[PDB]
Amino acid sequence: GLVVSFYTPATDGATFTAIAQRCNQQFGGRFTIAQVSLPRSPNEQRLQLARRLTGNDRTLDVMALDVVWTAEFAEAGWALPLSDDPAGLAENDAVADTLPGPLATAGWNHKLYAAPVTTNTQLLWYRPDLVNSPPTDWNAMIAEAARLHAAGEPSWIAVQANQGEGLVVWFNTLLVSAGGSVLSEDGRHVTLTDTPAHRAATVSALQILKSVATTPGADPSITRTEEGSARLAFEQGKAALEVNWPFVFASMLENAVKGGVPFLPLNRIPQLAGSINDIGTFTPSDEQFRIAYDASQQVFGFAPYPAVAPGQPAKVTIGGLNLAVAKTTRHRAEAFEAVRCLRDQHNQRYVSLEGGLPAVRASLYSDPQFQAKYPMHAIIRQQLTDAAVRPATPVYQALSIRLAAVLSPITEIDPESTADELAAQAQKAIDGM
Numbered sequence: 001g002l003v004v005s006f007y008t009p010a011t012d013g014a015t016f017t018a019i020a021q022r023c024n025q026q027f028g029g030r031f032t033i034a035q036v037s038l039p040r041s042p043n044e045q046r047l048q049l050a051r052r053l054t055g056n057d058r059t060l061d062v063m064a065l066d067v068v069w070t071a072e073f074a075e076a077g078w079a080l081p082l083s084d085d086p087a088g089l090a091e092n093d094a095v096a097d098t099l100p101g102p103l104a105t106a107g108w109n110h111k112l113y114a115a116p117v118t119t120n121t122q123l124l125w126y127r128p129d130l131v132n133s134p135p136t137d138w139n140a141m142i143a144e145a146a147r148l149h150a151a152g153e154p155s156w157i158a159v160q161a162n163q164g165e166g167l168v169v170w171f172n173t174l175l176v177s178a179g180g181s182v183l184s185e186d187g188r189h190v191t192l193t194d195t196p197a198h199r200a201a202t203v204s205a206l207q208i209l210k211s212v213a214t215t216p217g218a219d220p221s222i223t224r225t226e227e228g229s230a231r232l233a234f235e236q237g238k239a240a241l242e243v244n245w246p247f248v249f250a251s252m253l254e255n256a257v258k259g260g261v262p263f264l265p266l267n268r269i270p271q272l273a274g275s276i277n278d279i280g281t282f283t284p285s286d287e288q289f290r291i292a293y294d295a296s297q298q299v300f301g302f303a304p305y306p307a308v309a310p311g312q313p314a315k316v317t318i319g320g321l322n323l324a325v326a327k328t329t330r331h332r333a334e335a336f337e338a339v340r341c342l343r344d345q346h347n348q349r350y351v352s353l354e355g356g357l358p359a360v361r362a363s364l365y366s367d368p369q370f371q372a373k374y375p376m377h378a379i380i381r382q383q384l385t386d387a388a389v390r391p392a393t394p395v396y397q398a399l400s401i402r403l404a405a406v407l408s409p410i411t412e413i414d415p416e417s418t419a420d421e422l423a424a425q426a427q428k429a430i431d432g433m
């Protein structure tokens with residue numbers, strides 16, 4: 001039968017290949033989904049897709065889009081509205097049993113242009129054997145890192161951010177938590193410095209970035225261009241504090257069982273032998289999960305994203321992936337049917353428990369079987385309820401490149417002058433409409 005191509009970030013390729021393989025057993029030979037990988041950064045994911053869409057690649061069917069690409073892809077006509085499903089089923093499927101934060105990321109001008117499949121929100125991860133209590137706010141993060149440094153313990157604050165989208169995400173979370181916003185609601189005005197309250201919020205966020213950058217024991221790689229992984233930095237013992245998306249939980253257990261985490265040698269537990277399956281995925285029994293998780297609790301804990309102001313939780317920038325059907329497809333009906341299978345209940349459970357990516361289905365966050373294997377479920381659902389959002393705008397690509405070039409390196413931030421530079425660069429981006 002026909003093949004529905006399914007483009008996804010390469011780092012999620014194995015997870016989505018597995019989901020596609022399950023979805024291929026249930027179409028009655030009518031068709032096959034074929035996963036195809038995209039590059040690592042959101043901007044290169046977008047670029048590969050945009051070049052196929054403008055090139056009229058008629059083999060491109062389903063795309064897993066970062067949440068920030070909806071406006072551009074809807075406005076360009078590249079993502080079909082869900083109302084273009086010939087079966088008329090896609091819109092109701094996308095909303096039913098789906099958390100509202102993820103859904104909002106999939107809309108443009110009051111219509112859905114994609115079906116959420118994964119969401120994302122950052123948590124604090126820490127070494128409980130080195131850090132007595134998890135820092136509750138950024139001042140406490142800095143104080144704990146300085147303490148670790150003076151004790152000769154690992155002292156980096158490993159935030160998943162370099163010089164790209166992740167740095168923009170970090171800034172956006174600090175900014176919205178402080179009451180600021182990059183753009184107005186409609187995306188037509190820059191709101192970083194246009195009122196005193198907005199300017200004060202921008203300055204407070206930049207002050208946090210600069211303070212973290214210049215804390216004793218800070219990662220010397222802030223001032224370098226080389227890409228870094230906060231996930232690997234922590235797994236290697238180079239940081240005892242990490243701010244990152246929740247896939248690091250699955251990664252900690254799997255890499256520990258593979259032998260890749262020196263302070264958690266789960267591969268030396270005979271009961272865990274053979275729990276990595278034949279293509280490299282940790283697939284434990286219930287007992288093996290208990291053993292691995294219980295052992296991990298001595299050296300790996302999680303907690304809310306640090307607060308920006310003492311006494312109120314942060315507003316944490318939402319992330320994730322939405323499934324869109326490309327205007328190029330020669331088989332809209334099967335592409336939308338594939339989208340519904342790829343996000344069904346069983347595959348949502350899989351994408352979180354094995355793939356490490358937070359599910360979008362509200363039912364799972366209320367399901368004790370899911371909660372038992374996804375122990376950060378309550379913090380995740382709370383942070384998705386009061387999430388910050390990056391600006392929705394068709395010129396997001398240019399806005400984010402401009403903002404990230406100003407913010408990096410964060411050691412060079414001067415709150416007041418950087419605030420004005422950010423606002424001017426943001427204005428250049430939206431002056432391309």
Ligand SMILES: OC[C@H]1O[C@H](O[C@H]2O[C@H](CO)[C@@H](O)[C@H](O)[C@H]2O)[C@H](O)[C@@H](O)[C@@H]1O
Binds near residue numbers: 040041066067319
């Ligand atoms: O779970 C890990 C995912 O990490 C990246 O995506 C997240 O981080 C991006 C950069 O800050 C955000 O734009 C995105 O919305 C987040 O989901 C990576 O791009 C994904 O492939 C990973 O699944």
